[PDB]
Design a protein around this nucleic acid. Structure first.
Ligand SMILES: [Mg+2]
Ligand SMILES: [Mg+2]
Ligand SMILES: [Mg+2]
Ligand SMILES: [Mg+2]
Ligand SMILES: [Mg+2]
Ligand SMILES: [Mg+2]
Ligand SMILES: [Mg+2]
Ligand SMILES: [Mg+2]
Ligand SMILES: [Mg+2]
Ligand SMILES: [Mg+2]
Ligand SMILES: [Mg+2]
Ligand SMILES: [Mg+2]
Ligand SMILES: [Mg+2]
Ligand SMILES: [Mg+2]
Ligand SMILES: [Mg+2]
Ligand SMILES: [Mg+2]
Ligand SMILES: [Mg+2]
Ligand SMILES: [Mg+2]
Ligand SMILES: [Mg+2]
Ligand SMILES: [Mg+2]
Ligand SMILES: [Mg+2]
Ligand SMILES: [Mg+2]
Ligand SMILES: [Mg+2]
Ligand SMILES: [Mg+2]
Ligand SMILES: [Mg+2]
Ligand SMILES: [Mg+2]
Ligand SMILES: [Mg+2]
Ligand SMILES: [Mg+2]
Ligand SMILES: [Mg+2]
Ligand SMILES: [Mg+2]
Ligand SMILES: [Mg+2]
Ligand SMILES: [Mg+2]
Ligand SMILES: [Mg+2]
Ligand SMILES: [Mg+2]
Ligand SMILES: [Mg+2]
Ligand SMILES: [Mg+2]
Ligand SMILES: [Mg+2]
Ligand SMILES: [Mg+2]
Ligand SMILES: [Mg+2]
Lengths: 119, 73, 155
RNA sequence: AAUGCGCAGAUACCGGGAGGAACGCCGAUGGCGAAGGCAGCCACCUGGUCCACCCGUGACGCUGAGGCGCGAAAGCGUGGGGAGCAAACCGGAUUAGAUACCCGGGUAGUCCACGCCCUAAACGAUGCGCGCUAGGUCUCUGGGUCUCCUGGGGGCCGAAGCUAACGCGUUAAGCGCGCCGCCUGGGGAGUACGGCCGCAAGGCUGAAACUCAAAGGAAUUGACGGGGGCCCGCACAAGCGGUGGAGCAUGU
């Protein structure tokens, strides 16, 4: 019952899950959701279908704080990334602008072995 | 194939050592802060080497970005 | 079919409704090459569809086929893991076959003793929305949209 | 998947702080270095190099046993530091087993200073120097009359030629001359012994008895691959009817 109307959607994409946080224009979360929140368990949380629900769930949850307009900020490499956007669009919520903000070091920390092979 | 608008062309009489000429320097970065390749700057082997050192300096002064945010997806 | 896409054969129309579907049904009802008493069944079934309902049989047979045609089905898939039940669309050619086959099979499960009757009641029950044929169709489509997670292997 | 973390409120998101390590794009097909090896930006202090002028000296040159210095990584000593990562190790999985591959942790270490160690697929597996022997082309960096000429450097294709072949070919593996290093069948064996070096781990140097009739280079035709590409077959899939169960026939 905060009332916000205008807000932000952070899609956190990953080869392993998808997590959608909705926030106010300052960045503080109104509500969130993910593959695990829609009752999926293992590999299926990375599945883009999951990502569709995960976004839709997170939407509706926020559409009851009277949201209408969202700035989208995609932030991950994974599957179910664009589908999380697709879901966000088709939820009536006006998507005012999508931005990729995947964080990337200017070569900094020694990565996990799994993620380097040939460096 | 692999050729659109070249950047050395859109401009004219500039100093590649001028690390304050933001209005000119910034034409050489992508939408992200990333310094454009030669195949898009249109600089020669050398000009590019000097411009990259120039852009780098201009980033430390806080005139040019280091990295920005893609706006479509 | 390794070489050519392989075309469908054109069954000659019914002798009594001048229809192709009705030959198809009659063919699925037939066993051991006894086409005479497969037709001798479907038609006996047709007399029964009227003397139990004001409706014309062709319109009912057609009506019930449509209620059994499945819009979705799964067929398994071997991946870089194992068996994944991929939800597929179902071509209009395959819905035909599936419906008819399911109709006969359902019909022959029934406890009525004459064959025509079993066909009759299944054909009727399926029009009116119920009956074993439809149940192994509402079922089939239920496995799709349950493996929805694997829709992203659309072939 | 599970260990694991999370109601002592994690994950996701915004704001502030600490710290350690690495330097995205530019950036490679590039540059520098004797080799190892060198990549954010600025300054200081230094090394090599290349061009033009054709000014100086006047054979002052080349190589180089030993000596001296340098020398990835790992490793060692003293002190510091410690984000991420990670031998050993602790768990979770997987498996016939799993001291492994996969997952969650994790110490030494990876970082810095100083002092050791001195190895390598330390590779172009190609010592250094100088002269000679078609050309084409791409590229880095100078100079001149700058459509083109002329240097230095990095690639590719190729004349002659060389090569067991592969290939090399003005950046020789061509034609020559100088000087150093090294080889002399496989194994035993970089082993033993001695000596020298090291804090240690170890390093250099380096055999013999014995034993084999091969060990080995390149290339050819095949066959094969849980290598690629292309393509067939009731091969699978789609479908109908069966065998496998019963009684009997028949063969084993
Ligand atoms: Mg617990
Ligand atoms: Mg509580
Ligand atoms: Mg965190
Ligand atoms: Mg923070
Ligand atoms: Mg700390
Ligand atoms: Mg070199
Ligand atoms: Mg090297
Ligand atoms: Mg100098
Ligand atoms: Mg003179
Ligand atoms: Mg004189
Ligand atoms: Mg010398
Ligand atoms: Mg060393
Ligand atoms: Mg070291
Ligand atoms: Mg130490
Ligand atoms: Mg220490
Ligand atoms: Mg300590
Ligand atoms: Mg581990
Ligand atoms: Mg770890
Ligand atoms: Mg040291
Ligand atoms: Mg040595
Ligand atoms: Mg020579
Ligand atoms: Mg010029
Ligand atoms: Mg050259
Ligand atoms: Mg070089
Ligand atoms: Mg020849
Ligand atoms: Mg020779
Ligand atoms: Mg030859
Ligand atoms: Mg050649
Ligand atoms: Mg030797
Ligand atoms: Mg011998
Ligand atoms: Mg030997
Ligand atoms: Mg040794
Ligand atoms: Mg000894
Ligand atoms: Mg001693
Ligand atoms: Mg061979
Ligand atoms: Mg083959
Ligand atoms: Mg089959
Ligand atoms: Mg039997
Ligand atoms: Mg016998």
């Amino acid at each position: 019952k905060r009332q916000v109307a205008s807000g932000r959607a952070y899609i956190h994409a990953s080869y392993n899950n998808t997590i959608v946080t909705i926030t106010d224009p300052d960045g503080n979360p109104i509500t969130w959701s993910s593959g695990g929140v829609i009752g999926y368990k293992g590999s299926r949380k990375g599945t883009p279908y999951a990502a569709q629900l995960a976004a839709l769930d997170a939407a509706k949850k926020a559409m009851a704080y009277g949201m209408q307009s969202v700035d989208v900020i995609v932030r991950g490499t994974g599957a179910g990334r664009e589908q999380a956007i697709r879901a966000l669009q088709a939820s009536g919520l006006q998507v005012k602008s999508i931005v990729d903000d995947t964080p990337v070091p200017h070569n900094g920390c020694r990565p996990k072995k799994k993620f380097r092979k040939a460096s | 194939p692999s050729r659109k608008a070249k950047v050395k062309a859109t401009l004219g009489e500039f100093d590649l050592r001028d690390y304050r000429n933001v209005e000119v320097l910034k034409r050489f970065l992508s939408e992200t802060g990333k310094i454009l390749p030669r195949r898009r700057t249109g600089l020669s082997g050398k000009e590019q080497r000097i411009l990259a050192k120039t852009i780098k300096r201009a980033r430390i002064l806080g005139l040019l970005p280091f990295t920005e945010k893609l706006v479509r997806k | 079919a390794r070489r050519r896409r392989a075309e469908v054969r054109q069954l000659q129309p019914d002798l009594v409704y001048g229809d192709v579907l009705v030959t198809a049904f009659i063919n699925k009802i037939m066993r051991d090459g006894k086409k005479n008493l497969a037709a001798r069944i479907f038609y006996d079934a047709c007399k029964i569809i009227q003397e139990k309902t004001g409706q014309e049989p062709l319109k009912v047979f057609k009506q019930a086929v449509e209620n059994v045609k499945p819009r979705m089905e799964v067929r398994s898939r071997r991946v870089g893991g194992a068996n994944y039940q991929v939800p597929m669309e179902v071509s209009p050619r395959r819905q035909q076959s599936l419906a008819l086959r399911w109709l006969v099979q359902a019909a022959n499960q029934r406890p009525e003793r004459r064959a025509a009757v079993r066909i009759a009641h299944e054909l009727m029950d399926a029009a009116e929305g119920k009956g074993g044929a439809v149940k192994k169709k509402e079922d089939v489509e239920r496995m799709a949209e349950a493996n929805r997670a694997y829709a992203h292997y659309r072939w």
